């Protein structure tokens, strides 16, 4: 076994096709499914697996009210191939009520947060084994990506904030190998508020593409150079914006280094890369809200702060339809890289109140470089007729 | 790890033993399956794997309601070990309404059609990863084989159809080197309507024996060559005809060359294979419906279409219980190339009314050049005792 | 991977130490477990698996009704790695209502049999393919062993039986390479009746313990020369007799040679092994009915047929609790080869009126050359509070 | 594939990260988990998995009354991959009702005990098959470690104890080469009372802090030479004591040799492992019944009997919460061998009268030497919406 290095063009992209459906809360009004949420997926060189953030029960359970809430001591980062559902054959790999996994090519990294608000404890784990820990250093709920993170040459990063939700927070980046953490920077350059980031390989170093949570509706970028551990940050241009409040289509802004502040309040994680001067982009359909979900390309949406010429739109799921949180991830072709990413389908509370819980399934989708139609992929499943 | 050539002679084939029964409709009555349908099998170079098309829910489960239904965005392609029945630990493959899966080799290629009516989308998923995807070109229900598709040399074929049901249709044949559509060739010869193609190797070659769902109670067969892409086509000789609808035994009659306009109008998947000038055949044993099934050998039915000569008869399926779909595999052997089918036992609506879901189960015989004696291998569930 | 030629002498044997136990109506009352019966015990080079011929149904379920019957077109051989329960996820690797695996060293062998009374089908599965089938010769319910055959160099030898149940039936032993049926050898010698044979290995021939349904309470000796495949057959001479029903220890004898004409009719499949001139044998403990299980070693039981001299008595399943079918497999460990043994435990109909399934679990004792206690380890279900 | 040494310095603790939690009750309220007691964990070269001993029951079940009992024959040990949850297809590896494993570099060992309370038997199973027995020698419970032996250079060492849960009793030091047993040292020393030792690997000897159950809350430790097979003994010094029941801590005193004689009946199965000469160590929280959890170290508590100086205080299950047995697991790190632990959440009778069952859950903890946070993870089951 070679460590991954990604040294690879990026994949000709002309939109994406469907990849991979759970429907796991369909099949647990007659299964035995975890609740869980923040899904995401990551791949070792052969195939995908599929992540979540259990809750510590099934759905069909007592223990399954008030799962809303997104801190206990139950909850664990679940893992499965992709497609097989969240099963009680599912392996809890480490406790953790936030966490981040990437494959280096020898093994699974997973960074696993779990512990009280205000003395949070991160986990860092390879090789199926504890190698690390760090202390949480704002002590104000310690938290990263929830999804994958990437590895370079042996060498992974993970983004982590601890601080506030709604002003300055404390952002750093770490450097893995072979679990352990050898070196921490500390964010830079103009991105004001950082989240949940969608983190890529561009060779030869590694980006991200984030959630600002304080005053941008557009989205952070950080820029992350694996030898020299350096940092540089900013916002994606697109006059399109990919985070959840924002202001509607005619009216919207961007800015390449500062945020919009435009009903800049609140988010999604969400994901977006670059394809020269444009933007490959998914958000929600509805703009104060967590309905429907497209995927488009805004021409010069990179480096244009102005452009709002989107082509190639893709309806995932229908403005009748939730959606939820979503991020990248890569897959090595024989010649090139591919992006994907997945679309969380939240459902139950807060939202409805047909039930008692709060649960996802989940919906993937990967570029390709050839053609595909139109279609919609919600969740599916019939609230009304759910275990109450 | 090299590539499948199939370079071996076809096995002796005196008739089919028992090989393999899944019993899922009995077992879904006290325990977790999957609502199904249109399986298939297909086999990597050590063991072989059952597929079918899911419905995103379990069978004792509120969302089986309505099942009947081809195309929805919660079906997905289900894929195990053989005799492994559908239980919740089964991995989805890819999403699809319509799908085709092989194995090279090295990996296993899926193809999985899902979407709008108008606007499907095939997906072409190679060793984990999406490596490609065409549009509908037609816009008219894009459709693949629901049965495995056939590789040599590391080249795969698979036929897929858009356009009319009940009319001329658009039917291509595509040629895929690791997941890659290298060539599309268009449908040439005889044959008029094409649907459902039950493919074999024949070195160096690949045949297939569709459905005409037009004007054809016989069968067409589609030849491809895989140096030059090629394509000529026909029906099945034999006046013994192996489609559903069809008329009976001493009124119907075949050509080789046009369909026979013989109730030909909707139709079965179904599968033959030649032996010399003599053809295997599977079909139902009712003229108009799906009820039971039976195999035999037609002497000169490959090749003169007004034997009605059969010999070396089998109930697969009993005259008074369920059957359905049915396909071809092949299995190579030490010496030779053996031939197996399986057959959808397909209950409940719109033919049965006490339940309110659609399901399968299935069985399996394979080629054998030994002896073998008699019997019946329905699917025994008892829809007057089932879920409510 | 090489053959296996089990060319080791046999391990020194003190009596049994426990080894496996499966719980599986205790679980079926909480779980959803397979209805079997037959059950048995084979190993590969690596580990043990566990075997049954399955009721094509879960114990909480309405299809469990009258699995008392022991031939329908619903029953498949299941397996599992030893100590796994019968869950769901449980591979089905044939048709069949009697069965034998074994395996080669390189590749499992199974031989299965399903079909009608008086036409039946037994298909030959090696390395996961359809190899061979053979048709019932008498037409009156061929069976098998019910337990593991036996392969030396590669070649692999299976007792297979036809005919009456109560009169002189036609016995067969196969040699099978790779699947493939190559001699077949029909029973020769002074045994009279034969059915359900333990064997195991005997360097360098094969040697079975089997069943009399006819005349005998002692048992038919069978004896495979594998490489000219001649046969001879005798009884197990021990004056102390493992069949049931039978006479009791002061009024039972046995014979060399001939049946011993006490209380002949009916049987259970056993099984027994020399130890020099002495014997190693279990039974029940009752003598007319299917309660309790024992093992004891008899000196001179081999040879002199007026000994009736036990030692190293142990009690497996005390004698107010249900037994069942037993019989032998063999483990090779580093300088010889070990003799274990699996003991089925009947619950149900019609013995017991409680409930209206019939099924198993199972507890298996491997032979050791070191000391060891006492203890009984039945069942353990309570029918009075099972599923209705 | 080499006999693991251990032969690596131990690595620096600052105290412990959090690694896994099973969450077994919570899932068992929907969902099929067995009712588990004694749990423990340890690993192959590569993973972890979680061992415990089935009460032959699944929790949702008539037979989970009454689990309160310690040994019957429906007892087996359970295996699963660390995180997988006790679900229906997990592997029984032997019937046992006291048990103990490792893996030593090469394959798997299982010490597992049934049968009669006054003549018990223990089987040692190595690599897939039975390799010996030895007989209960007091014939007053044979029982062992309930947490995983050691193995060095391919020698794996084990202690059992037969006798007096309250007065002297017999221990013994079994050392086993591939299951074979070699040797057998009886215990020496100035321990008085050894039960359910810990023991973790100390290049080029073998550890082991126990329970002592007659007159001591001081922990018995036992030093294992693996090459004379000599057998030394004694005491934990530390002031602040590790067994339950015990005095509080301004009460509590120890002795490095003799048991204190404080509230020193009854126990609970826990760990210490010494760092210089400070000490490592965990223990329940309330002093006379098994509620909460907490670990820390003693400085000179390794050497000196009169130090209660305790730094680095976790709390890993709050007072108010549920604990029970701890035991103590070796993972090789690329540079040094780590120390992890495990904490039975014991739920249900006799403590707890909501339910007739009595079961657990784990939670997991591993050395680190970065840096930490709180937390509390319990069981979190309610048992008033239970089953009943
Ligand atoms: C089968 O499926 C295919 C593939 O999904 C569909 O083709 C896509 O259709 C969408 C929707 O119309 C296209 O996305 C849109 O592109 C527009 C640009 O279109 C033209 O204009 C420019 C500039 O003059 C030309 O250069 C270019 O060639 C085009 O002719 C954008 O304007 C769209 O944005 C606006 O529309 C959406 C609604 O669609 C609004 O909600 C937005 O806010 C905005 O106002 C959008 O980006 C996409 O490009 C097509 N892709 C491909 C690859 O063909 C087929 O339509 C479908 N077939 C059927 C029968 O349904
Ligand atoms: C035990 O199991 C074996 C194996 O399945 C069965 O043997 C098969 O039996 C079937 C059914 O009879 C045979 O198939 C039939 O072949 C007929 C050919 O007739 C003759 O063929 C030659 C010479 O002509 C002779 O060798 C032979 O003796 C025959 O007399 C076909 O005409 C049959 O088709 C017609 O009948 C069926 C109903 O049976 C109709 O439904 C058809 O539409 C059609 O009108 C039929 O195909 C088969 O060849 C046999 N195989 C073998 C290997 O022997 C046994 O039947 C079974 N035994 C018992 C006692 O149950
Ligand atoms: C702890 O566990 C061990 C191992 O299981 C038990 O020891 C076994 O005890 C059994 C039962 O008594 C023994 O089996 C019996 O062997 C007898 C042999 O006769 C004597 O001769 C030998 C050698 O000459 C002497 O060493 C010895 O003293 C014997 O007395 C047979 O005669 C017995 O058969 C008869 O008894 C049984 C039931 O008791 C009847 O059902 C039969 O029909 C028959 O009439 C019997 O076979 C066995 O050999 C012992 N094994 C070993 C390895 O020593 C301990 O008993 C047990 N301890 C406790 C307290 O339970
Ligand atoms: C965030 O997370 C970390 C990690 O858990 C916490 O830091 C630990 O806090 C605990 C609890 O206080 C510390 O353990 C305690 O250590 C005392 C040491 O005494 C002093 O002396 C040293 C130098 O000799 C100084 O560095 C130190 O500041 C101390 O003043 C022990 O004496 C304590 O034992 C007594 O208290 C406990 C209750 O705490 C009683 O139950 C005992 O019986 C006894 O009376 C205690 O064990 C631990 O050392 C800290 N670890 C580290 C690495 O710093 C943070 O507290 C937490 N932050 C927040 C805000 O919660
Ligand atoms: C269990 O099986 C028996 C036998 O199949 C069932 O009883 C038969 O039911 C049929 C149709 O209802 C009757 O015509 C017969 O008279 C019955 N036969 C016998 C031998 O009793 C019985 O109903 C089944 N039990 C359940 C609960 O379904
Ligand atoms: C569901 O929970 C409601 C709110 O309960 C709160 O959160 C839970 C987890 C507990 O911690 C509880 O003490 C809190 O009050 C309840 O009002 C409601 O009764 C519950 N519903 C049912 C059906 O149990
Ligand atoms: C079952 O469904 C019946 C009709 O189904 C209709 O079409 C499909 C696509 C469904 O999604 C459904 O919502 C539509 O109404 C209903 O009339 C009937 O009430 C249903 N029965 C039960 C028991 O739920
Ligand atoms: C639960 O069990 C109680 C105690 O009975 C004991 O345990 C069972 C398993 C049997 O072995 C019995 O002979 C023992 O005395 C019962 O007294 C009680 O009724 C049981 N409760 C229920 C609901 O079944
Ligand atoms: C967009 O939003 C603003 C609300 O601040 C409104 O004035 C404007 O008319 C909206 N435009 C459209 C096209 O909805
Ligand atoms: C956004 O979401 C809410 C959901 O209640 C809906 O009522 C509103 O009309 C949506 N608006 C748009 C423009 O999609
Ligand atoms: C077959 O059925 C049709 C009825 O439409 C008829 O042409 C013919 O007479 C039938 N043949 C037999 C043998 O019944
Ligand atoms: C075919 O099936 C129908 C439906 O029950 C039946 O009524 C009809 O008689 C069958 N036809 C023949 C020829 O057996
Ligand atoms: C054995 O059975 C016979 C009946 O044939 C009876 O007379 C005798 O008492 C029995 N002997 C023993 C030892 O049970
Ligand atoms: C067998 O059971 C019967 C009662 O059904 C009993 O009388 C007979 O003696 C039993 N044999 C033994 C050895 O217990
Ligand atoms: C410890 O637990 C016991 C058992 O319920 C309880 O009575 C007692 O109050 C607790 N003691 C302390 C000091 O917390
Ligand atoms: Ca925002
Ligand atoms: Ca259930
Ligand atoms: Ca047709
Ligand atoms: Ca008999
Ligand atoms: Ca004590």
């Not at 504890?130 to 709920?141: G, T």
């Not at 904030?161 to 770490?174: N, P, R, V, Y």
């Not at 551990?229 to 005619?250: A, E, F, M, Q, W």
């Not at 679309?343 to 570029?367: D, Q």
């Amino acid at each position: 076994a070679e460590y991954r290095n990604w040294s690879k063009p990026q994949c000709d992209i002309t939109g994406f096709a469907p990849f991979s459906k759970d429907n796991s809360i369909r099949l647990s009004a007659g299964g035995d499914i975890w609740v869980t949420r923040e899904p995401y997926v990551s791949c070792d060189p052969d195939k995908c697996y599929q992540f979540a953030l259990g809750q510590g029960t099934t759905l069909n359970n007592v223990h399954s009210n008030n799962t809303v809430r997104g801190r206990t001591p139950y909850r664990t980062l679940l893992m499965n191939e992709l497609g097989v559902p969240f099963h009680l054959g599912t392996k809890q790999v480490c406790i953790a009520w936030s966490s981040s996994s990437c494959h280096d090519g020898k093994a699974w990294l997973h960074v696993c947060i779990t512990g009280d608000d205000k003395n949070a404890t991160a986990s860092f784990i390879y090789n199926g084994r504890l190698v690390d820990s760090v202390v949480s250093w704002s002590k104000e709920i310690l938290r990263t990506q929830e999804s994958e993170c990437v590895c370079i040459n042996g060498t992974c990063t993970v983004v982590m904030t601890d601080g506030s939700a709604s002003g300055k927070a404390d952002t750093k980046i770490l450097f893995i190998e072979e679990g352990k953490i050898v070196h921490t920077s500390t964010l830079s350059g103009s991105a004001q508020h950082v989240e949940e980031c969608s983190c890529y390989p561009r060779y030869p170093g590694v980006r991200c593409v984030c959630r600002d949570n304080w005053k941008g509706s557009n989205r952070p970028i950080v820029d992350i150079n694996i030898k020299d551990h350096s940092i540089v940050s900013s916002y994606v241009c697109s006059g399109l914006v990919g985070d959840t409040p924002r202001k509607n289509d005619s009216s919207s802004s961007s800015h390449c280094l500062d945020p919009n502040n435009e009903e800049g309040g609140h988010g999604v994680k969400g994901w977006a890369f670059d394809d020269g001067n444009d933007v490959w982009m998914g958000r929600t359909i509805n703009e104060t809200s967590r309905l429907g979900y497209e995927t488009f390309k805004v021409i010069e949406g990179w480096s244009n702060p102005k452009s709002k010429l989107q082509i190639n739109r893709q309806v995932i799921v229908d403005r009748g339809n939730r959606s939820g949180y979503s991020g990248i991830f890569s897959v090595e072709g024989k010649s090139c890289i591919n992006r994907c990413f997945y679309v969380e389908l939240i459902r139950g509370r807060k939202e409805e109140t047909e039930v008692l819980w709060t649960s996802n399934s989940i919906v993937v989708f990967c570029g390709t470089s050839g053609t595909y139609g139109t279609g919609s992929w919600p969740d599916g499943a019939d609230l009304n007729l759910m275990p109450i």
